[PDB]
């Protein structure tokens, strides 16, 4: 019994698709927030306590770019908020302590009966993930905050790949062969659980084609860390992975199995 587990036994096909949680969305403000620039908050309505993710678009993105994995992610079982950053022009760094404050954010609402995600959130559950510099903004936050349980770096970008050498949460990188995300994933630590999947834009992870295979991945990262469900390993790191991997996928690494 994983206390964590939600949603039906997986296939590939309910991977490639909305999920079985009708999900609501709400705007979180700037005036409501000072650690980021508010955004777009995805949520289940079903009861219960669900992990947290913080998503970070890119450099001049919004979180309306990033919508695909509110909903994609949130339906499958999680409370998703979709960051705006403070400025469109805020680097990782800043793009990684937004993901952290908009963690905590979720953690507080969790605790408030004003709020719709009133105790929906396992507050000990949090991810990250984000497009671009919001990417390298997701694996800083990993990096500075290993109690995460997963982190999603989507065609990351960073000034430095040296700064990744001491990540140690379970860390999925997606890159796009026409595009920086190799050695970012060759810096991580071989000790820390990682994954890197090469599709064959910049922004081909972005709202981006491959969003059935991406997303199927992503979810399955996040049920396999976040909820601890081993129910997807064949998803990471087995039989179907592989016939991902073997396809739309130019190349792929990781240190399976988990």
Known sequence: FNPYQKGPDPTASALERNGPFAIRSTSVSRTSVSGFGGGRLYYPTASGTYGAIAVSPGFTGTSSTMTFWGERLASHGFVVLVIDTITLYD??????????????????????????????????????????????????????????????????????????????????????????????????????????????????????????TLGKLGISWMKRFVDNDTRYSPFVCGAEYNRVVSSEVSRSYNNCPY
Request: charged share 20%; net charge positive; with cysteine.
């Open 91 to 212: 680097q990782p760094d800043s793009r990684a302590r937004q993901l952290k404050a908009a963690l905590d954010y979720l953690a507080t609402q969790n605790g408030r009966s004003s709020s719709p995600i009133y105790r929906k959130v396992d507050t000990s559950r949090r991810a990250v993930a984000g497009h671009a510099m919001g990417g390298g903004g997701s694996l800083l936050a990993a990096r500075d905050n290993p109690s995460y349980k997963a982190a999603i770096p989507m065609a990351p970008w960073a000034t430095s790949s040296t700064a990744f050498r001491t990540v140690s949460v379970p860390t999925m990188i997606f890159g796009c062969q026409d595009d920086s995300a190799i050695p970012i994933y060759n810096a991580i630590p071989n000790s820390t659980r990682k994954n890197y999947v090469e599709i064959r834009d910049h922004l081909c992870v972005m709202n981006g084609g491959h969003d059935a």
